[PDB]
Amino acid sequence: IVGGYTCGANTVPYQVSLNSGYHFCGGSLINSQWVVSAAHCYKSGIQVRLGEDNINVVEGNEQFISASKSIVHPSYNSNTLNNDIMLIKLKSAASLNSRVASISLPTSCASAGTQCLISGWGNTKSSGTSYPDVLKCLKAPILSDSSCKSAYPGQITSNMFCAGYLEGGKDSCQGDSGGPVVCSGKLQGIVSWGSGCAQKNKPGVYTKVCNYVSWIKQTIASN
């Protein structure tokens, strides 16, 4: 996250870190046994880390649970990033409380102008590299479809939305991928892609979770 603020320990209780020896992507806990992330985050041998603030220090609220099954969306296209969404089932159910909690799936799609919270352990610089040890947060609005399409001609599908600031300076970034965009207490987005980070006229692009609720629910019910 570029231009954000330090969240504070366990203030984002649904945030997960996906670990394969090192943090590589974010995700969101949607019930005690299932995590949603980006399809482009797919790897074999994932450990999900819940209750994290500093990802390099054991602070006492962590739960580490291996993935038993990963399911990339049937229509994921890695060239276009259309349908950039994946489900991860945990080998055992997490223990839920105030510091580790699930986030609700949306009933409806959020509108342009809605303020959302985006979080993760990704790069904090628009040029150069600096990865934080603690979780960072950013409040950003959903942009209109017209402004999103004008920023990225020919690249925005009905399964994506833009959020952020056209002036630049504030955005998600590499390493935030797969993480949550929460608006009005509901999961509306997954951190997906963007051209660099925090560049002028190049906002973040997010997977539009409201289009996937049927597939998520049906999948969970049968796996």
User: What are the catalytic residues?
Assistant: 40, 84, 177
Cα 43 to Cα 48: distance, rounded to the nearest angstrom:
12
Cα 163 to Cα 117: distance, rounded to the nearest angstrom:
10
**Minimal distance in Å, beta carbon 57 to Ca ion?**
5
Cα 145 to Cα 136: distance, rounded to the nearest angstrom:
27
Q: In terms of CB distance, is 11 or 199 closer to Ca ion?
A: 11
Residue 171 is assigned to a ligand binding site: yes
Residue 146 is assigned to a ligand binding site: no
Q: How many other β-carbons are positioned within 10 Å of the β-carbon of residue 51?
A: 22
By CB under 5 A, the count of residues binding Ca ion is: 3
**Which string of DSSP letters, residue by residue, matches 209-222?**
GGGGHHHHHHHHHH
Cα 203 to Cα 81: distance, rounded to the nearest angstrom:
16
Binding mask 38-77 for Ca ion (x = CB under 5 A): --------------x-x----x------------------
Q: In terms of CB distance, is 49 or 208 closer to Ca ion?
A: 49
Residue 57 is assigned to a ligand binding site: yes
Binding site listing for substrate = 171-172, 174-175, 177
Q: Which residues sit at the interface with Ca ion, rule CB under 5 A? A: 52, 54, 59
